[PDB]
Amino acid sequence: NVYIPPCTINNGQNIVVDFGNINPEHVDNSRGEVTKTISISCPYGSLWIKVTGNTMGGGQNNVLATNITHFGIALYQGKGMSTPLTLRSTFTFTSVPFRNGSGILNGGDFRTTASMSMIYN
């Protein structure tokens, strides 16, 4: 068409980071660090990516809250729990479970959602 369109993200497929069947009781310092790689196919990169969503209390700036109190999902840029991810080509990000409290957790299953914005120049 006359207008150059925006890039297609991982072939218009749905993006879901699955942690399989795991007990919310982990070390949250090296566990189900699930890495995800989503492809970016553009027409012509001039694009910015910002990730936002509900966060748990505390001083962490890369952790999403879940449907389980004291349990969240921490995010990191690229493959590896090294550099954090503050809340044609590809984009890789690592997600790892994180519990900010000792004691019992009300929930064996968990799910959360984050927004990934493609901001065009």
Binding site: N1, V2, Y3, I4, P5, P6, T8, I9, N10, N11, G12, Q13, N14, I15, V16, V17, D18, F19, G20, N21, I22, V34, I38, P43, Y44, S46, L64, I73, S95, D109, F110, R111, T112, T113, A114, S115, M116, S117, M118, I119, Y120, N121
Partner: protein, 215 residues
Amino acid sequence: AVSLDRTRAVFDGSEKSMTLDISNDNKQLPYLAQAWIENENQEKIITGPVIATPPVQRLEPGAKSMVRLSTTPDISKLPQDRESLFYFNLREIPPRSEKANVLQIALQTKIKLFYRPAAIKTRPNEVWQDQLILNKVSGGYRIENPTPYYVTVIGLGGSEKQAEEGEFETVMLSPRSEQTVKSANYNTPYLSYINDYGGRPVLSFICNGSRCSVK
């Protein structure tokens, strides 16, 4: 994922509305598409002067629809001798995954929305970016945009290839403004920009000392 038909939208101030085509590129699942406007600081505004409707709509796999952008009477309050900046946003609400213990990513697209007053309405073949002036300074150039339009600079090199290909920190000059960018020195500077349609034209500059102007 739900996608937009363009990377920037230009709202012709002479009209009261316009539409943007969207489409659900997923071939399996239906998606909800949220649309909203944000001001120049990327803060959501729900009261105008530019409105998006519908705020939410359902899209069947492979289906396409549109979003209507319209103005309110307060649109008259914006300056009419220059463009104003807004951002259009479209966020998809994916279907609930059956598998539990998952992180669902909701994709969103955010593009610039240029309100262009009727008083500065442009012709179909008009190119105002050739009015840009480059002034050589230590470490790069001070770019001057004397026009009433926002100008997004995506490249600057000593050749056509460098301009369009070369690594460059994209910057957008607001109407009648200027700003310095880092860059090597070039005999005949070439500058690339993103136009109203998303095309990326290349310009050629000729210099007279430290001041360079489009040939």
